[PDB]
Amino acid sequence: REIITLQLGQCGNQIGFEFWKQLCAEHGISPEAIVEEFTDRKDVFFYQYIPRAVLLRVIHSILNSPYAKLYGNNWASGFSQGEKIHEDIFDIIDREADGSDSLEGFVLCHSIAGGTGSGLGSYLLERLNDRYPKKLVQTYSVFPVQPYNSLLTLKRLTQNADCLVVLDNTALNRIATDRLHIQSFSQINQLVSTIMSASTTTLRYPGYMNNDLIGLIASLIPTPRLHFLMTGYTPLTTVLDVMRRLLQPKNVMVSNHCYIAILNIIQGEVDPTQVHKSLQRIRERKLANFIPWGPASIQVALSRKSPYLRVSGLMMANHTSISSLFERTCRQYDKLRKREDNFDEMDTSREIVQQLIDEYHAATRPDYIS
Amino acid sequence: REIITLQLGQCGNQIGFEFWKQLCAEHGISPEAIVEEFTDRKDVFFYQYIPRAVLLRVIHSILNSPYAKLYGNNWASGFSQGEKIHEDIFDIIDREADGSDSLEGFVLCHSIAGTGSGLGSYLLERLNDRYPKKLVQTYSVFPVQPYNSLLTLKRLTQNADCLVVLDNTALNRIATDRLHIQSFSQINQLVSTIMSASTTTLRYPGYMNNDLIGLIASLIPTPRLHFLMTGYTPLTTVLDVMRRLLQPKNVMVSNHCYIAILNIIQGEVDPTQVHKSLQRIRERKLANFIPWGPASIQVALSRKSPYLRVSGLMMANHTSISSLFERTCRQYDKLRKREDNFDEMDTSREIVQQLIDEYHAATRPDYIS
Ligand SMILES: Nc1nc2c(ncn2[C@@H]2O[C@H](COP(=O)(O)OP(=O)(O)O)[C@@H](O)[C@H]2O)c(=O)[nH]1
Numbered sequence: 001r002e003i004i005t006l007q008l009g010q011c012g013n014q015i016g017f018e019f020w021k022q023l024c025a026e027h028g029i030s031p032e033a034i035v036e037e038f039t040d041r042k043d044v045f046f047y048q049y050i051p052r053a054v055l056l057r058v059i060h061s062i063l064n065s066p067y068a069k070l071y072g073n074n075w076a077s078g079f080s081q082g083e084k085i086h087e088d089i090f091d092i093i094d095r096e097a098d099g100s101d102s103l104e105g106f107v108l109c110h111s112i113a114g115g116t117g118s119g120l121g122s123y124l125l126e127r128l129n130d131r132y133p134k135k136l137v138q139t140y141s142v143f144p145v146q147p148y149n150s151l152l153t154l155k156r157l158t159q160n161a162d163c164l165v166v167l168d169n170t171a172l173n174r175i176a177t178d179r180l181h182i183q184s185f186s187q188i189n190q191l192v193s194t195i196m197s198a199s200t201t202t203l204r205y206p207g208y209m210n211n212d213l214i215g216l217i218a219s220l221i222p223t224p225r226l227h228f229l230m231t232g233y234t235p236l237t238t239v240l241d242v243m244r245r246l247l248q249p250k251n252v253m254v255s256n257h258c259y260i261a262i263l264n265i266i267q268g269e270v271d272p273t274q275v276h277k278s279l280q281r282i283r284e285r286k287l288a289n290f291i292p293w294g295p296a297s298i299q300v301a302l303s304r305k306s307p308y309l310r311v312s313g314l315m316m317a318n319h320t321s322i323s324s325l326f327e328r329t330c331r332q333y334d335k336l337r338k339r340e341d342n343f344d345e346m347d348t349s350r351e352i353v354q355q356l357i358d359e360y361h362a363a364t365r366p367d368y369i370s
Numbered sequence: 371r372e373i374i375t376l377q378l379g380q381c382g383n384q385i386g387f388e389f390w391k392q393l394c395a396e397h398g399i400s401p402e403a404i405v406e407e408f409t410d411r412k413d414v415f416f417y418q419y420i421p422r423a424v425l426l427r428v429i430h431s432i433l434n435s436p437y438a439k440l441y442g443n444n445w446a447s448g449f450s451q452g453e454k455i456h457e458d459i460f461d462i463i464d465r466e467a468d469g470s471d472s473l474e475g476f477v478l479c480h481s482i483a484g485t486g487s488g489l490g491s492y493l494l495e496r497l498n499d500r501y502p503k504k505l506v507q508t509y510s511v512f513p514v515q516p517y518n519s520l521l522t523l524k525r526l527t528q529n530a531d532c533l534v535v536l537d538n539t540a541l542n543r544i545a546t547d548r549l550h551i552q553s554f555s556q557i558n559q560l561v562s563t564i565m566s567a568s569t570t571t572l573r574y575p576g577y578m579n580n581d582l583i584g585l586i587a588s589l590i591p592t593p594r595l596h597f598l599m600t601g602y603t604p605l606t607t608v609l610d611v612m613r614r615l616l617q618p619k620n621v622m623v624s625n626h627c628y629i630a631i632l633n634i635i636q637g638e639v640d641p642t643q644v645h646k647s648l649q650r651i652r653e654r655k656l657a658n659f660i661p662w663g664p665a666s667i668q669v670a671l672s673r674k675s676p677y678l679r680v681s682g683l684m685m686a687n688h689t690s691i692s693s694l695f696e697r698t699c700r701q702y703d704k705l706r707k708r709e710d711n712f713d714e715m716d717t718s719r720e721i722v723q724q725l726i727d728e729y730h731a732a733t734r735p736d737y738i739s
């Protein structure tokens with residue numbers, strides 16, 4: 001099962017580039033797309049090496065980079081341009097689709113901060129559900145007239161994208177000043193590319209459990225509505241050190257409340273005899289709170305680092321606190337609704353997200369059923 | 371068994387002149403008709419070396435080309451003048467026939483869109499009179515134009531024992547999509563790639579398909595459904611090539627099902643994963659065939675010329691070729707309501723309707739009777 005990526009706007013093409021650098025570094029792949037001398041299945045992302053990239057100004061500098069051999073501002077205008085090149089761009093997708101053995105998903109790297117890609121992102125997801133109804137789509141959207149373009153794409157992402165990994169630049173810059181002391185764009189993305197790289201540690205390296213993209217998502221997302229995730233990455237030393245440093249709100253990449261499911265990926269060679277002990281100490285101290293209705297647990301799996309390149313770890317969670325972020329956005333909309341052909345699509349968009357904000361607040365009650 | 375080819379009209383000359391150039395280089399033959407020193411069977415098309423061609427103001431363009439030592443617009447004008455030189459051009463074909471050991475076919479290259487239309491209609495009629503046992507394959511090219519086009523189809527549906535369609539419209543797309551031309555001097559380069567790779571099994575002898583009648587009788591089941599379309603992917607295993615040939619993006623054509631498929635693999639691919647891919651194509655069901663008769667897919671390998679990497683060509687007998695006719699049939703009636711007997715056009719009109727009905731009847735589970 002092969003995976004293919006799409007990068008839109010200025011943001012998606014930037015972080016996706018460094019995502020291609022860091023991933024190409026994990027394997028023994030020279031910048032010139034040639035294997036050097038110097039186990040790891042490199043066929044899911046690379047096709048004989050050629051990466052399955054689809055890039056939609058900065059592209060000129062991208063080819064000017066040493067990795068050349070590796071291949072308006074409104075929302076409606078971003079949606080219009082996507083319609084003007086409907087068939088022209090789509091041929092690239094189809095020829096890459098069936099030319100591949102068995103497509104599994106569609107990784108989408110894009111921003112919703114008022115860019116032409118933000119609309120461009122809204123269009124592709126509509127058609128991706130039109131043509132291929134049996135193909136999962138994952139999107140690593142990133143959060144910041146900015147209220148407008150933000151709340152609109154949320155209307156499409158809640159019914160087309162079967163998964164989503166949110167990344168807000170606000171909580172990122174807090175990490176930038178504190179533990180890197182920058183006071184730039186190419187500076188914060190250094191850590192962002194790290195999150196995505198380790199996010200697919202269980203895919204590029206074979207393991208027992210979770211050997212496919214449906215193996216990770218099916219456990220966390222309980223319903224096609226509550227389909228929002230957050231990430232964590234602690235190394236910036238035993239197992240009880242990792243999981244305890246992950247649950248802190250100082251590390252989460254997000255600006256009652258409880259968890260639904262957690263996933264912790266350990267990449268080190270740590271002694272696996274103590275992984276159950278760390279699970280006991282986290283329970284007894286009661287450092288995290290779960291749902292009361294159904295039995296919700298925390299899962300951990302192991303894998304191995306790139307031998308070419310120390311204990312790392314990733315935390316993936318579905319927290320109902322993500323509802324607060326939306327409330328920050330939609331509140332700005334009502335304020336911009338009273339201050340400034342039909343303006344009816346903006347109505348149903350505001351309408352459908354307010355159903356989602358109702359769906360989260362209802363999950364925290366012991367009687368969420370019915 | 372030798373195959374004497376014919377070239378009519380500006381189209382037939384240009385494709386044939388560039389067909390020979392593709393063949394002369396694929397063998398160790400200098401344009402001076404002299405073998406270069408630098409196994410491949412070359413007697414079918416060449417006579418010990420001279421090509422067996424009978425051409426018919428572009429001729430001067432060939433006589434000035436470095437290959438000089440190798441040899442109106444009405445359909446009625448083509449059929450009329452062809453009758454005035456009945457004895458002239460048949461003197462050449464006859465003297466070229468008996469000089470050959472045992473004649474096998476007449477590969478005729480002409481475009482149905484000026485004089486090549488009316489003259490070719492005359493030849494395909496006259497050949498069946500004198501030569502009743504000679505196959506007549508034609509590499510016809512699809513584009514008053516609706517008139518001259520369909521009139522040739524009257525003859526091409528009862529005389530030509532085979533026909534390979536190559537429409538300029540679908541070619542122009544591939545010229546624009548993957549070549550970005552915007553020219554005749556470029557699209558013919560693709561045509562010459564299709565014509566040369568079509569007879570790769572005759573010039574390179576293998577297990578089977580050592581004669582033209584071996585490639586014909588396999589695909590064409592009945593004397594009427596004798597229209598074939600082509601597919602050429604290289605513009606890597608056998609599964610990579612087989613999957614690309616069945617995509618509608620590669621076919622040179624602008625319910626529906628196949629009748630017979632022949633795959634030509636000109637690579638050095640080991641002959642062990644040939645059955646595995648065919649096994650896989652059946653599983654994923656990338657193509658469907660006729661329900662009435664047993665239809666199977668055939669694959670053939672060959673060897674690339676060392677004097678000149680995996681390629682692939684597919685000979686297809688698809689029912690969707692009936693669509694190209696309807697476009698001609700449609701525009702005819704429009705010109706029939708817009709303006710010594712004018713009966714030949716109506717008689718030709720009837721027989722084309724019999725053909726299209728036969729195609730749409732071929733996709734029925736009761737095509738028999
Ligand atoms: N997280 C992150 N966001 C970025 C980066 N570069 C640009 N952005 C976001 O992209 C937005 C600008 O979009 P822009 O490039 O003008 O859209 P385009 O011109 O249509 O591609 C800003 O609001 C930024 O928040 C980056 O390196 N990291």
Ligand SMILES: Nc1nc2c(ncn2[C@@H]2O[C@H](COP(=O)(O)OP(=O)(O)O)[C@@H](O)[C@H]2O)c(=O)[nH]1
Pocket residue numbers: 378379380381384385442443481483484485486487511512513538554555557558561
């Ligand atoms: N594919 C292809 N078709 C051609 C080329 N040259 C001419 N044709 C076709 O031939 C037709 C014109 O035929 P024409 O030369 O007038 O015939 P003539 O009256 O006997 O000279 C046009 O409709 C074209 O479609 C060529 O180089 N390639």
